[PDB]
């Protein structure tokens, strides 16, 4: 129990258990909490960037609705490991939806408000085929009195159009250093991490639109600090060194090579840079940040460099070779 929750990473150690610990999306948790007193829970469709709280808030809503006793008998969960095909979604999901709700015990009925319906959660619905989602339509429509569906996804476009109308949409906003710093402060205080004044802001800015990455980053930084045993604080450089963030000096060197240089010099420096392990996505992001936030260039350069960086990012997002794409980006940005 407590020793079990102690023996797991900070991601699972501080996973919110109720609707009050999820301090990121006040627009959706309000409806989910108002649903408690009422009984008209519509078919939900949580969608948003990775690591935001969807899978962690649906479980909290379930725990608060039914309780630890009825939860294991009143919900079905199809996330990714089960075989979610047309035959399975036609047989098993339909059988569980067209099924009588279980009898709530006196303890559960007295403590938690038990609504007269079960819950089928299809986690990461963007991995299902089109025929499975098409079959889900009337299955979720006709048995709406004893079963409510909750879909979760990172891309709403992948879900077919009919399911985008049946379910009520809930967009989970990204987590920057503005509305998510409180949870990180609370975790750092609960773990006695000797953080600096503004290192949490840098941690949250590194994990653009994500919190779990920031949590594991803080955990790794605290572990590396405790290993040395010096007890000193952790600097922004200390956390950005292990976060994949490329140092600023070598970035300035890259920009200096771009500002003037032939094809051979840039190719040699790109090879030497790729000799070390640097994620091309982070390098592209930092180059974009440095070039856009600057004011020393002209608009006729800014528009072209923005388009080129966008094209390079779209190329890198398809899982291609980092070296070739980075070299092409640097050559094309030097051509201007």
């Amino acid at each position: 129990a407590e020793q079990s929750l102690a023996q797991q990473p900070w991601v699972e150690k501080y996973r919110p258990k109720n609707l009050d610990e999820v301090t990121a999306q006040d627009h959706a948790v309000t409806v989910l909490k108002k649903t408690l007193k009422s009984a008209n829970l519509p078919h939900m469709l949580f969608y948003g960037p990775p690591g935001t709280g969807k899978t962690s808030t649906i479980l909290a809503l379930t725990k608060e609705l039914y309780g630890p006793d009825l939860m294991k008998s009143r919900i079905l969960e199809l996330n990714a490991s089960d075989e979610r095909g047309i035959s399975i979604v036609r047989e098993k999901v339909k059988n569980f939806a067209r099924l009588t709700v279980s009898k709530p015990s006196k303890h559960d009925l007295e403590n938690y408000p038990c609504p007269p319906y079960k819950i089928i959660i299809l986690d990461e619905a963007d991995s299902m085929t089109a025929d499975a989602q098409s079959a889900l339509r009337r299955t979720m429509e006709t048995y709406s009195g004893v079963t409510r569906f909750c879909l979760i996804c990172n891309y709403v476009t992948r879900i077919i159009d009919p399911l985008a109308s049946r379910c009520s949409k809930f967009r989970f906003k990204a987590l920057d250093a503005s509305n998510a710093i409180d949870r990180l402060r609370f975790i750092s205080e609960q773990e006695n991490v000797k953080c600096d004044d503004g290192v949490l802001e840098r941690i949250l800015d590194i994990s653009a639109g994500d919190l779990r990455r920031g949590i594991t980053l803080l955990q790794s930084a605290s572990k590396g600090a405790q290993y040395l045993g010096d007890g000193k604080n952790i600097t922004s450089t200390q956390v950005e060194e292990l976060a994949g963030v490329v140092p600023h000096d070598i970035l300035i060197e890259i920009v200096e090579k771009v500002k003037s240089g032939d094809f051979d010099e840039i190719k040699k420096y790109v090879n030497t840079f790729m000799k070390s392990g640097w994620s091309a996505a982070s390098v592209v992001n930092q180059l974009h940040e440095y070039y856009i936030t600057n004011d020393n260039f002209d608009t006729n350069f800014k528009n072209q460099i923005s388009w080129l960086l966008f094209t390079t990012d779209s190329r890198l997002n398809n899982g291609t070779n980092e070296h070739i794409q980075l070299l092409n980006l640097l050559v094309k940005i030097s051509q201007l």
Binding site: V31, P116, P162, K302, N303, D313, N317
Partner: protein, 329 residues
């Protein structure tokens, strides 16, 4: 325990009869005259998602036979198997025998028949017309290209136009009658423009803004509550961002974009659509501007559909807008 008030607003307000189906007047009238005269040919409903097709056909099945429609009426939705081995045995046996309860024509409702294999439709092509004086087929669909031309020709085509403003307004008034609630006129206009014809999104965001009132009996749903429930960008800051992108320089435009998209937690996918809808009204005095303005924005939207980055795509939108608004000068 179980009652009518526990159902979500998507299904709680399902039209029971044909009289509670607004918007598609020119089809409901023809269907009522069909069932009144006594003749009812093979129907084929074709419309966008959430228009009233299934509700209309269920109300028709209730009106024809009685309050017990799912007794002598067969219904093959996408939840049942509809292979060729099914259209061979089940549908043919249902269409080759009489009813069990009364003496009338039988009804077969093939809901969402666009999800049928070509062989199944080719097999149905002859059984749909071999037994005509006893059974009638009703094919509901959203994509009119999945159906073979033969099956598409045998059925009378009825298109379900998207709900106009008046129909959604009447439905909103009827919902506000049964549920103690008040809704602002500008909020009504924003909800209509956000509906995009979808009658389900209307009821969904309505339930949301009702839940986000903390006392859904006195306070009225203003436009801010509706814009917050779905997270859609208000026209105000949308036009402000568009003006700052068109007029100001790069640094301050990027700053105001990052400030607007972080004040309420907006999404770039919605900002792109809003800017496109606002900017489609401009009178560009050249054709080369709109070409790039659409091409680059569509490419950026397709790239967002894969979730590559979040700020590079925003600066890409800014650059596309600025570079497209340059051939004018």
């Amino acid at each position: 325990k179980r009652s009518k008030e526990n159902l979500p607003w998507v299904e709680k307000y399902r039209p029971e009869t044909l009289d509670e189906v607004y918007g598609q007047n020119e089809v409901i009238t023809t269907v009522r005259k069909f069932v009144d005269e006594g003749k009812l040919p093979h129907l084929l409903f074709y419309g966008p998602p959430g228009t009233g097709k299934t509700s209309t056909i269920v109300a028709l099945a209730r009106e024809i036979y009685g309050k017990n429609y799912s007794n002598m009426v067969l219904e093959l939705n996408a939840s049942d198997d509809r292979g060729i081995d099914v259209v061979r045995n089940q549908i043919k046996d249902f269409a080759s025998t009489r009813q069990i309860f009364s003496k009338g024509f039988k009804l077969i409702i093939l809901d969402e028949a666009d999800a049928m294999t070509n062989a199944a439709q080719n097999a149905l092509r002859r059984v749909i017309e071999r037994y005509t004086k006893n059974t009638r087929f009703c094919v509901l669909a959203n994509y009119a290209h999945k159906l073979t031309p033969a099956l598409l020709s045998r059925c009378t085509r009825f298109r379900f136009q998207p709900l106009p403003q008046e129909a959604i307004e009447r439905r909103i008034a009827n919902v506000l009658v049964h549920e103690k609630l008040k809704l602002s006129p500008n909020a009504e206009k924003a909800l209509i423009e956000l509906s995009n014809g979808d009658m389900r999104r209307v009821l969904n965001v309505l339930q949301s803004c009702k839940a986000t009132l903390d006392n859904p009996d006195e306070d009225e749903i203003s436009d801010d509550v509706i814009y917050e429930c779905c997270g859609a960008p208000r026209p105000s800051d949308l036009k402000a961002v568009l003006k700052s992108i068109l007029e100001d320089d790069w640094g301050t435009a990027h700053y105001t974009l990052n400030k607007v998209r972080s004040a309420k937690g907006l999404a770039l996918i919605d900002l792109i659509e809003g800017i496109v809808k606002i900017l489609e009204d401009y009178e560009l005095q050249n054709e080369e501007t709109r070409v790039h303005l659409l091409t680059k924005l569509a490419d950026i939207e397709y790239s967002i559909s894969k979730g590559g980055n979040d700020q590079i795509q925003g600066s890409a939108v800014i650059g596309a807008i600025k570079a497209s608004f340059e051939n004018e000068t």
